[PDB]
mmCIF file of C-alpha atoms and ligand atoms in Angstrom:
data_model
loop_
_atom_site.group_PDB
_atom_site.id
_atom_site.type_symbol
_atom_site.label_atom_id
_atom_site.label_comp_id
_atom_site.label_asym_id
_atom_site.label_seq_id
_atom_site.Cartn_x
_atom_site.Cartn_y
_atom_site.Cartn_z
ATOM 1 C CA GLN A 1 108.995 117.526 102.806
ATOM 2 C CA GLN A 2 108.384 116.045 106.259
ATOM 3 C CA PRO A 3 104.810 116.644 107.491
ATOM 4 C CA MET A 4 105.789 114.990 110.791
ATOM 5 C CA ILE A 5 103.938 111.665 111.134
ATOM 6 C CA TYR A 6 102.412 110.467 114.419
ATOM 7 C CA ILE A 7 100.831 107.219 115.613
ATOM 8 C CA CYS A 8 97.414 107.329 117.246
ATOM 9 C CA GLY A 9 96.966 106.186 120.827
ATOM 10 C CA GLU A 10 94.346 103.442 120.664
ATOM 11 C CA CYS A 11 93.871 103.079 116.884
ATOM 12 C CA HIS A 12 97.620 102.750 116.140
ATOM 13 C CA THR A 13 97.057 104.441 112.772
ATOM 14 C CA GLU A 14 99.434 106.935 111.128
ATOM 15 C CA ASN A 15 98.495 110.609 111.035
ATOM 16 C CA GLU A 16 99.993 113.721 109.459
ATOM 17 C CA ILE A 17 99.958 116.593 111.948
ATOM 18 C CA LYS A 18 101.497 119.894 110.859
ATOM 19 C CA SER A 19 102.246 122.950 112.963
ATOM 20 C CA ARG A 20 99.353 125.054 114.234
ATOM 21 C CA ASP A 21 97.002 122.082 113.923
ATOM 22 C CA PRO A 22 95.086 120.062 116.510
ATOM 23 C CA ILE A 23 96.494 116.834 117.917
ATOM 24 C CA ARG A 24 93.794 114.347 116.980
ATOM 25 C CA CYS A 25 93.509 111.177 114.972
ATOM 26 C CA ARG A 26 92.058 111.163 111.473
ATOM 27 C CA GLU A 27 89.353 108.776 112.722
ATOM 28 C CA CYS A 28 87.630 108.054 116.054
ATOM 29 C CA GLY A 29 89.169 111.177 117.540
ATOM 30 C CA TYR A 30 91.579 110.896 120.438
ATOM 31 C CA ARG A 31 93.960 113.332 122.072
ATOM 32 C CA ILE A 32 96.921 110.979 122.437
ATOM 33 C CA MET A 33 99.441 109.974 119.826
ATOM 34 C CA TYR A 34 103.083 109.003 119.819
ATOM 35 C CA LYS A 35 105.858 109.541 117.340
ATOM 36 C CA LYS A 36 107.622 107.137 115.038
ATOM 37 C CA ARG A 37 111.137 105.783 115.404
ATOM 38 C CA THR A 38 113.903 107.953 114.000
ATOM 39 C CA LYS A 39 115.687 107.175 110.736
ATOM 40 C CA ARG A 40 119.214 107.508 112.144
ATOM 41 C CA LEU A 41 121.754 104.670 112.424
ATOM 42 C CA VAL A 42 120.588 102.997 115.621
ATOM 43 C CA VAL A 43 123.592 100.705 116.075
ATOM 44 C CA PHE A 44 124.335 98.812 119.277
ATOM 45 C CA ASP A 45 127.208 96.741 120.596
ATOM 46 C CA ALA A 46 125.797 93.508 121.977
ATOM 47 C CA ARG A 47 127.945 93.935 125.070
ATOM 48 C CA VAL B 1 94.490 123.055 74.458
ATOM 49 C CA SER B 2 95.953 120.269 72.325
ATOM 50 C CA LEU B 3 98.785 118.604 74.320
ATOM 51 C CA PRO B 4 98.583 115.668 76.771
ATOM 52 C CA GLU B 5 101.414 116.928 78.972
ATOM 53 C CA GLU B 6 99.476 120.085 79.869
ATOM 54 C CA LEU B 7 96.240 118.131 80.371
ATOM 55 C CA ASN B 8 97.804 115.573 82.734
ATOM 56 C CA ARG B 9 98.436 118.370 85.259
ATOM 57 C CA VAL B 10 94.884 118.283 86.652
ATOM 58 C CA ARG B 11 94.791 114.493 86.363
ATOM 59 C CA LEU B 12 93.548 113.360 89.785
ATOM 60 C CA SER B 13 95.453 110.141 90.427
ATOM 61 C CA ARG B 14 94.252 107.420 92.785
ATOM 62 C CA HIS B 15 96.791 108.331 95.475
ATOM 63 C CA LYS B 16 95.690 111.965 95.769
ATOM 64 C CA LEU B 17 91.961 111.217 96.100
ATOM 65 C CA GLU B 18 92.701 109.276 99.297
ATOM 66 C CA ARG B 19 93.418 112.532 101.159
ATOM 67 C CA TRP B 20 90.078 114.190 100.356
ATOM 68 C CA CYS B 21 87.643 111.384 101.100
ATOM 69 C CA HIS B 22 85.937 113.538 103.739
ATOM 70 C CA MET B 23 87.316 117.053 103.235
ATOM 71 C CA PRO B 24 84.663 119.765 102.700
ATOM 72 C CA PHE B 25 84.526 121.795 99.479
ATOM 73 C CA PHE B 26 84.794 118.485 97.622
ATOM 74 C CA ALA B 27 82.322 119.480 94.900
ATOM 75 C CA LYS B 28 84.137 122.828 94.548
ATOM 76 C CA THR B 29 87.708 121.469 94.442
ATOM 77 C CA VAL B 30 87.090 118.311 92.377
ATOM 78 C CA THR B 31 84.518 119.486 89.822
ATOM 79 C CA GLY B 32 86.774 120.588 86.961
ATOM 80 C CA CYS B 33 89.648 118.112 86.886
ATOM 81 C CA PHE B 34 89.791 114.969 84.748
ATOM 82 C CA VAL B 35 90.422 111.342 85.695
ATOM 83 C CA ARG B 36 91.410 108.272 83.678
ATOM 84 C CA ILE B 37 88.454 106.120 84.694
ATOM 85 C CA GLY B 38 88.857 102.499 83.624
ATOM 86 C CA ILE B 39 86.058 100.987 81.543
ATOM 87 C CA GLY B 40 87.481 97.648 80.405
ATOM 88 C CA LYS B 41 90.365 95.711 77.451
ATOM 89 C CA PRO B 42 93.214 98.137 78.274
ATOM 90 C CA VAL B 43 91.345 101.014 76.602
ATOM 91 C CA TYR B 44 90.524 104.071 78.707
ATOM 92 C CA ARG B 45 88.107 106.980 78.344
ATOM 93 C CA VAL B 46 88.563 110.383 79.963
ATOM 94 C CA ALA B 47 85.328 111.909 81.245
ATOM 95 C CA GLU B 48 84.311 115.227 82.767
ATOM 96 C CA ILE B 49 83.418 115.551 86.448
ATOM 97 C CA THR B 50 79.886 116.953 86.606
ATOM 98 C CA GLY B 51 79.273 116.535 90.338
ATOM 99 C CA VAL B 52 79.344 114.116 93.274
ATOM 100 C CA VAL B 53 77.010 111.320 94.368
ATOM 101 C CA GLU B 54 76.848 108.753 97.159
ATOM 102 C CA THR B 55 76.293 105.145 96.130
ATOM 103 C CA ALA B 56 74.408 102.621 98.246
ATOM 104 C CA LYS B 57 77.316 100.146 97.983
ATOM 105 C CA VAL B 58 80.228 100.352 100.436
ATOM 106 C CA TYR B 59 83.648 99.176 99.259
ATOM 107 C CA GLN B 60 87.167 99.225 100.699
ATOM 108 C CA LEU B 61 89.980 100.907 98.749
ATOM 109 C CA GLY B 62 93.202 99.585 100.244
ATOM 110 C CA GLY B 63 93.266 101.021 103.750
ATOM 111 C CA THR B 64 90.373 103.485 103.815
ATOM 112 C CA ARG B 65 86.813 102.910 102.578
ATOM 113 C CA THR B 66 84.196 105.223 101.070
ATOM 114 C CA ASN B 67 80.802 105.054 99.350
ATOM 115 C CA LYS B 68 81.009 108.206 97.201
ATOM 116 C CA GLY B 69 81.003 107.652 93.456
ATOM 117 C CA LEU B 70 81.681 110.144 90.676
ATOM 118 C CA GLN B 71 79.065 111.328 88.175
ATOM 119 C CA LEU B 72 81.195 111.397 85.016
ATOM 120 C CA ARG B 73 80.319 112.071 81.381
ATOM 121 C CA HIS B 74 82.187 111.420 78.113
ATOM 122 C CA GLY B 75 80.563 113.772 75.619
ATOM 123 C CA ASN B 76 77.049 112.361 75.923
ATOM 124 C CA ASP B 77 77.292 108.968 77.638
ATOM 125 C CA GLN B 78 76.965 109.401 81.406
ATOM 126 C CA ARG B 79 76.495 106.943 84.266
ATOM 127 C CA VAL B 80 77.583 106.252 87.842
ATOM 128 C CA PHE B 81 81.215 105.328 88.550
ATOM 129 C CA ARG B 82 83.504 104.657 91.513
ATOM 130 C CA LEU B 83 86.871 105.955 92.707
ATOM 131 C CA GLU B 84 88.355 102.436 92.822
ATOM 132 C CA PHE B 85 88.370 101.995 89.026
ATOM 133 C CA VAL B 86 90.394 105.165 88.377
ATOM 134 C CA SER B 87 93.930 104.418 87.198
ATOM 135 C CA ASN B 88 97.197 106.241 87.857
ATOM 136 C CA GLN B 89 98.332 106.277 84.217
ATOM 137 C CA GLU B 90 98.550 109.529 82.280
ATOM 138 C CA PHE B 91 96.522 110.501 79.215
ATOM 139 C CA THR B 92 98.231 108.732 76.325
ATOM 140 C CA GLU B 93 98.124 110.142 72.806
ATOM 141 C CA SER B 94 95.439 107.703 71.637
ATOM 142 C CA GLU B 95 93.209 108.397 74.647
ATOM 143 C CA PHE B 96 93.785 112.135 74.228
ATOM 144 C CA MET B 97 92.711 112.001 70.579
ATOM 145 C CA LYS B 98 89.700 109.871 71.520
ATOM 146 C CA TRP B 99 88.626 112.382 74.164
ATOM 147 C CA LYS B 100 89.091 115.266 71.721
ATOM 148 C CA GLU B 101 86.976 113.505 69.096
ATOM 149 C CA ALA B 102 84.279 112.743 71.669
ATOM 150 C CA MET B 103 84.214 116.387 72.775
ATOM 151 C CA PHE B 104 84.036 117.665 69.191
ATOM 152 C CA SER B 105 81.205 115.228 68.423
ATOM 153 C CA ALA B 106 79.224 116.093 71.562
ATOM 154 C CA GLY B 107 79.637 119.833 70.950
ATOM 155 C CA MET B 108 80.891 120.712 74.436
ATOM 156 C CA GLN B 109 83.414 123.521 74.049
ATOM 157 C CA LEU B 110 86.863 122.346 75.084
ATOM 158 C CA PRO B 111 88.202 123.969 78.281
ATOM 159 C CA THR B 112 90.600 126.889 77.969
ATOM 160 C CA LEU B 113 94.327 126.767 78.674
ATOM 161 C CA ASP B 114 94.068 129.612 81.191
ATOM 162 C CA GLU B 115 91.102 127.841 82.797
ATOM 163 C CA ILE B 116 93.191 124.702 83.328
ATOM 164 C CA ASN B 117 96.117 126.796 84.569
ATOM 165 C CA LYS B 118 93.996 128.596 87.171
ATOM 166 C CA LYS B 119 92.173 125.388 88.161
ATOM 167 C CA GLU B 120 95.263 123.225 88.709
ATOM 168 C CA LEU B 121 96.321 125.567 91.529
ATOM 169 C CA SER B 122 93.134 124.640 93.407
ATOM 170 C CA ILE B 123 94.427 121.190 94.359
ATOM 171 C CA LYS B 124 97.818 122.674 95.248
ATOM 172 C CA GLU B 125 96.344 125.277 97.605
ATOM 173 C CA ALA B 126 93.916 122.713 99.061
ATOM 174 C CA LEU B 127 96.632 120.143 99.816
ATOM 175 C CA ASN B 128 98.459 122.578 102.120
ATOM 176 C CA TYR B 129 95.223 123.723 103.771
ATOM 177 C CA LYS B 130 95.593 124.127 107.528
ATOM 178 C CA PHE B 131 92.974 122.234 109.551
ATOM 179 C CA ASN B 132 92.299 125.108 111.941
ATOM 180 C CA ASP B 133 88.505 125.134 111.574
ATOM 181 C CA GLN B 134 86.147 122.495 112.997
ATOM 182 C CA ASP B 135 86.370 119.908 110.204
ATOM 183 C CA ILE B 136 88.199 117.156 112.090
ATOM 184 C CA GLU B 137 84.986 116.364 113.951
ATOM 185 C CA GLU B 138 83.026 115.893 110.727
ATOM 186 C CA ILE B 139 85.859 113.824 109.251
ATOM 187 C CA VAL B 140 85.983 111.430 112.193
ATOM 188 C CA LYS B 141 82.177 111.227 112.238
ATOM 189 C CA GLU B 142 81.958 110.363 108.538
ATOM 190 C CA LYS B 143 84.739 107.803 109.009
ATOM 191 C CA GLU B 144 83.188 106.069 112.022
ATOM 192 C CA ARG B 145 79.828 106.093 110.230
ATOM 193 C CA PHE B 146 81.114 103.244 108.028
ATOM 194 C CA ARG B 147 84.099 101.974 110.035
ATOM 195 C CA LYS B 148 82.753 99.330 112.405
ATOM 196 C CA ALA B 149 83.398 99.975 116.095
ATOM 197 C CA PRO B 150 84.995 96.817 117.600
ATOM 198 C CA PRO B 151 88.219 97.276 115.594
ATOM 199 C CA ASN B 152 90.255 97.043 117.709
ATOM 200 C CA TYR B 153 92.009 98.516 120.751
ATOM 201 C CA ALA B 154 88.761 100.176 121.925
ATOM 202 C CA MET B 155 86.799 97.030 122.802
ATOM 203 C CA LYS B 156 86.754 97.862 126.518
ATOM 204 C CA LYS B 157 85.721 101.446 125.791
ATOM 205 C CA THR B 158 82.895 100.240 123.554
ATOM 206 C CA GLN B 159 81.726 97.787 126.213
ATOM 207 C CA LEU B 160 81.746 100.510 128.870
ATOM 208 C CA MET C 1 110.686 89.182 131.901
ATOM 209 C CA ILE C 2 112.130 86.637 129.462
ATOM 210 C CA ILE C 3 114.200 83.499 129.995
ATOM 211 C CA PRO C 4 117.911 84.384 129.942
ATOM 212 C CA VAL C 5 120.155 83.036 127.226
ATOM 213 C CA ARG C 6 122.729 81.613 129.655
ATOM 214 C CA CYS C 7 123.333 81.008 133.340
ATOM 215 C CA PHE C 8 124.828 83.917 135.236
ATOM 216 C CA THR C 9 127.105 81.610 137.222
ATOM 217 C CA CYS C 10 128.082 78.797 134.852
ATOM 218 C CA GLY C 11 127.422 80.011 131.330
ATOM 219 C CA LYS C 12 125.527 77.061 129.930
ATOM 220 C CA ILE C 13 122.885 77.911 127.365
ATOM 221 C CA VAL C 14 119.454 77.894 128.996
ATOM 222 C CA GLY C 15 117.208 80.059 126.819
ATOM 223 C CA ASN C 16 116.531 77.041 124.590
ATOM 224 C CA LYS C 17 115.060 75.004 127.453
ATOM 225 C CA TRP C 18 112.124 76.979 128.850
ATOM 226 C CA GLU C 19 109.628 75.513 126.387
ATOM 227 C CA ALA C 20 110.971 72.001 126.913
ATOM 228 C CA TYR C 21 110.716 72.583 130.661
ATOM 229 C CA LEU C 22 107.079 73.654 130.431
ATOM 230 C CA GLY C 23 106.294 70.676 128.220
ATOM 231 C CA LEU C 24 107.989 68.193 130.541
ATOM 232 C CA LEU C 25 106.235 69.647 133.571
ATOM 233 C CA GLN C 26 102.890 69.514 131.775
ATOM 234 C CA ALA C 27 103.329 65.925 130.611
ATOM 235 C CA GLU C 28 103.953 64.422 134.050
ATOM 236 C CA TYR C 29 107.560 65.017 135.094
ATOM 237 C CA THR C 30 108.087 66.990 138.276
ATOM 238 C CA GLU C 31 110.622 69.820 138.389
ATOM 239 C CA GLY C 32 113.356 67.796 140.057
ATOM 240 C CA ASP C 33 112.984 65.214 137.301
ATOM 241 C CA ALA C 34 112.465 67.529 134.319
ATOM 242 C CA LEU C 35 115.587 69.500 135.272
ATOM 243 C CA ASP C 36 117.916 66.499 135.131
ATOM 244 C CA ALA C 37 115.958 65.307 132.096
ATOM 245 C CA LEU C 38 116.926 68.468 130.227
ATOM 246 C CA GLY C 39 120.460 68.136 131.595
ATOM 247 C CA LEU C 40 121.231 70.627 134.368
ATOM 248 C CA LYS C 41 123.636 68.929 136.778
ATOM 249 C CA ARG C 42 124.940 72.034 138.538
ATOM 250 C CA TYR C 43 122.448 73.633 140.889
ATOM 251 C CA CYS C 44 123.536 77.065 139.655
ATOM 252 C CA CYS C 45 121.677 76.472 136.403
ATOM 253 C CA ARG C 46 118.533 74.912 137.867
ATOM 254 C CA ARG C 47 117.575 78.247 139.406
ATOM 255 C CA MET C 48 117.213 79.738 135.921
ATOM 256 C CA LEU C 49 114.228 77.391 135.509
ATOM 257 C CA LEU C 50 112.917 77.022 139.073
ATOM 258 C CA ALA C 51 112.809 80.734 139.777
ATOM 259 C CA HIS C 52 112.445 82.355 136.367
ATOM 260 C CA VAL C 53 109.307 84.450 136.232
ATOM 261 C CA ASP C 54 107.621 84.772 132.841
ATOM 262 C CA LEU C 55 106.267 88.323 132.558
ATOM 263 C CA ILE C 56 106.583 88.584 128.769
ATOM 264 C CA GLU C 57 103.107 87.045 128.664
ATOM 265 C CA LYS C 58 101.607 89.912 130.670
ATOM 266 C CA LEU C 59 103.619 92.293 128.505
ATOM 267 C CA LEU C 60 102.129 90.877 125.305
ATOM 268 C CA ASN C 61 98.627 91.040 126.778
ATOM 269 C CA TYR C 62 98.901 94.793 126.101
ATOM 270 C CA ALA C 63 98.795 94.338 122.364
ATOM 271 C CA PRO C 64 99.469 97.613 120.525
ATOM 272 C CA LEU C 65 97.188 97.169 117.523
ATOM 273 C CA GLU C 66 94.430 94.577 117.233
ATOM 274 C CA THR D 1 104.588 112.059 99.520
ATOM 275 C CA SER D 2 102.239 113.297 96.776
ATOM 276 C CA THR D 3 101.613 110.007 94.921
ATOM 277 C CA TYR D 4 103.940 107.095 95.746
ATOM 278 C CA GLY D 5 102.798 104.985 92.816
ATOM 279 C CA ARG D 6 106.011 103.373 91.580
ATOM 280 C CA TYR D 7 102.365 100.590 87.406
ATOM 281 C CA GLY D 8 100.341 100.850 90.608
ATOM 282 C CA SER D 9 98.340 98.205 92.465
ATOM 283 C CA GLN D 10 96.204 96.455 89.836
ATOM 284 C CA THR D 11 93.339 98.816 89.002
ATOM 285 C CA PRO D 12 89.935 97.156 88.663
ATOM 286 C CA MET D 13 87.654 97.846 85.689
ATOM 287 C CA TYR D 14 83.957 98.643 85.425
ATOM 288 C CA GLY D 15 82.818 95.896 83.050
ATOM 289 C CA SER D 16 84.910 93.322 84.909
ATOM 290 C CA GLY D 17 82.471 93.383 87.828
HETATM 291 ZN ZN1 ZN E 1 91.491 111.333 115.958
HETATM 292 ZN ZN1 ZN E 2 125.325 77.747 135.819
#
């Protein structure tokens, strides 16, 4: 159950955008939005 | 109908109402379910949803903020309420018996089991409703109507 | 963009001296005096403070939210 | 993600106001 969450451009609010849906924020109304960091094991070697 | 487990199915919790603060067909998809509105000490009273009304007082509910109340009624007593007082607890046995007694005293015929069964699917089919029409514009308009502009990363845009 | 943690040449810790350097320069000490005040004998480590550019400030100016 | 209640977040009352 992953509705694919995005982050608005200027508002920096979370939005739930599913397939076959417009890419806009729940408020204001922009056309830019980024994704959220993955949930994988981002491990680095301080080298 | 005489069980609380089957009645709690259409119980609109406080977390679900946050996703239909500005979705159309509100009066058609909400009118019919029951909520555990808090009166206040820990006693609760289930009431029927008769319609929808907009109150002149604006209040913030966690992250979002709305000014739409909920015209409820418990047998005969009716008055204006708000969506912030609704609790997430289920209909206990005592509250269920109290609601049944209130309904029997008011005379309103209790809903039917098949009615509840065919109404509970309304919220399910509305949750997964694709936003393909032109409702996002109305949603953002109704939001910005109350959400003040300066906040926050659009100060330059507002000045321009 | 940000003060290094050590000197590329020597290896002495220097990230914990940028704030002290700014404070000493703002009080009254010049650079040649504030450097030896902090304790940077070798000239290889004084460059980390005489030449370090501080762009993290401009970077933070682009606040994401609020 | 239906209702992440986990109880709740202190629900206000009507008469309390
Ligand atoms: Zn938008
Ligand atoms: Zn060095």
